[PDB]
Design a protein around this ligand. Structure first.
Ligand SMILES: CCCCCCCCCCCCCC(=O)O[C@H](COC(=O)CCCCCCCCCCC)COP(=O)(O)O
Lengths: 431, 51
């Protein structure tokens, strides 16, 4: 495989997979949820859903073109998938959708129907999807009074104040030339995409997205959304992780991989090679957990989210999990590092080299927006092979051993104790 | 009546100095470890009454 890249003010980056049967072509902007003030919050979600609106999707589906979109903290994307003989049709449709006009998408009826639909979706997310809203409050309290705290989904109190003028103001300030990368993944060649872009004009705008006054800074805090009428207790807990373009990126991900993920109901998940499972399976402390190493442009998060029904033994869950985290600084073995190497090679090659072209388009767009070129997977495997136990211990002493944490929880979290015992459990007192 | 008087007053000087320093240090550590609880805030939006 190979990733090429060229420039004319726009950036054209591709992945010619000749074995695939489709071809995704779309623009990936460099603005995201982290580029909004807290009063126009959710305008990226509303651009996602006016791009995926019914009239626009119908006009797309007349030619056999499926639309896709994604709103992250750092990057938006607007991807159009088609057969590999219709890349010109997809480019001309994306041109007509964004560049040539926006007033037909931003009519009164389409905007009011879409605002109604996104208000319904945000309310449905707020009162029914519990582990994701725990993770969103974890971001909202780890990075508070700072633009990386804003949720990608938007809030009900802000999103019902947006009108068309704010949509157009965000479009003029963020849908720009240098801010964007046009991405073609799947079964298209790079030269075909560049010659077809130069065949059209496709000039988005003059350029220069506004620069944020405040950089992201981690802030140890907690938020407790206690709802006694829920059957479980969802809780995330994280420290300041590593951002992208850091030398400790793959080390932070391998540290997340050491303790892995778990599902107490699957039989092959209870037999993993984690030493936390011997403590966690005896009295059935949780139903599931997953360790995440989230990496953003300015900062990052490293921690775990979990859910449990054993609501009287939440503190034992947090206790054994954090003592296992303290094992990284002091006495992590060689076999755990080798196992995490093999599993992280596995899940990283599943992530970057799955068969779905829209996910490849999102990942390639994000990576060539942030760091200018895509690191191919072989050099990634060499960087994973270069990690030793001393690198993990040095990273854990830098980032894990007695550092501030951020906690978010909802449900029956009365069994979760104060902030100070969870904070003081980050250092063992025995080392 | 009081043959210990000299040593009693100098050990009193040592003990009052050490315990005053311990009392001020312990006031600092109590104000420190309670700082997560003094500054804690609660907001309350009343829930949807349909449930
Ligand atoms: C076993 C319970 C005893 C508790 C005593 C508390 C009453 C306060 C008066 C203490 C005066 C007697 C000591 C003394 O004369 O030392 C004097 C010095 O003063 C002190 O340091 C007293 C400080 C008390 C700190 C308490 C620490 C807690 C220890 C718990 C037991 C392990 C004489 O010192 P010196 O013989 O010269 O070494």
């Amino acid at each position: 495989a190979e990733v090429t890249q060229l420039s004319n003010g726009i950036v054209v980056a591709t992945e010619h997979n000749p074995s695939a049967h489709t071809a995704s072509v779309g623009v990936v902007f460099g603005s995201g949820a982290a580029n909004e003030n807290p009063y126009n919050n959710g305008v990226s979600n509303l651009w996602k859903n006016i791009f995926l609106s019914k009239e626009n999707s119908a006009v797309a589906a007349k030619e056999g073109l499926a639309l896709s979109s994604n709103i992250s903290r750092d990057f938006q994307s607007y991807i159009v998938s088609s057969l590999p003989g219709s890349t010109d049709k997809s480019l001309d449709f994306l041109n007509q959708s964004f560049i040539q006009q926006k007033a037909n998408l931003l009519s009164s009826s389409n905007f009011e129907a879409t605002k109604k639909s996104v208000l319904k979706q945000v309310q449905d997310f707020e009162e029914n999807d519990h582990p994701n809203r725990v993770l969103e409050h974890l971001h909202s309290t780890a990075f508070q009074n700072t633009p990386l705290s804003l949720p990608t989904r938007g809030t009900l109190e802000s999103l019902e104040n947006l009108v068309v003028a704010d949509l157009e103001s965000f479009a003029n300030n963020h849908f720009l030339n240098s801010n964007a990368v046009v991405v073609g993944t799947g079964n298209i060649k790079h030269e075909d995409l560049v010659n077809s872009i130069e065949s059209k004009n496709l000039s988005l705008q003059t350029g220069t997205k506004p620069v944020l006054k405040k950089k992201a800074a981690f802030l140890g805090s907690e938020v407790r959304l206690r709802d006694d009428t829920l059957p479980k207790a969802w809780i995330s807990l994280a420290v300041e992780g590593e951002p992208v373009n850091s030398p400790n990126y793959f080390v932070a991900k391998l540290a997340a991989q050491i303790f892995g993920s778990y599902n107490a109901f699957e039989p092959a998940s209870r037999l993993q090679g984690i030493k936390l499972l011997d403590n966690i399976q005896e009295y059935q402390l949780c139903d599931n957990f997953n360790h995440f190493s989230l990496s953003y442009k300015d900062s990052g998060l490293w921690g775990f989210s979990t859910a449990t029904r054993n609501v009287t033994m939440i503190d034992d869950l947090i206790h054994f999990t954090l003592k296992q985290w303290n094992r990284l600084t002091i006495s992590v073995t060689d076999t755990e590092v080798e196992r995490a190497k093999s599993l992280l090679k596995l899940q990283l090659g599943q992530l970057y080299e799955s068969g779905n072209p829209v996910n490849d388009a999102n990942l390639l767009g994000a990576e060539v927006l942030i760091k200018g070129s895509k690191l191919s997977l072989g050099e990634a495997f060499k960087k994973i092979d270069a990690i030793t136990v001393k690198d993990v211990k040095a990273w854990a002493g830098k980032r894990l051993w007695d550092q501030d944490i951020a906690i978010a929880g909802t449900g029956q979290i009365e069994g979760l104790l104060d902030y100070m015992r969870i904070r003081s459990d980050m250092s063992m007192m025995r080392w | 009546a009081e043959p210990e008087h000299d040593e009693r007053k100098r050990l009193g000087l040592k003990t009052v100095i050490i315990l005053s320093s311990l009392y001020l240090l312990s006031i600092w550590v109590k104000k420190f470890k309670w700082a997560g609880i003094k500054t804690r805030k609660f907001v309350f939006n009343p829930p949807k009454p349909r449930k």
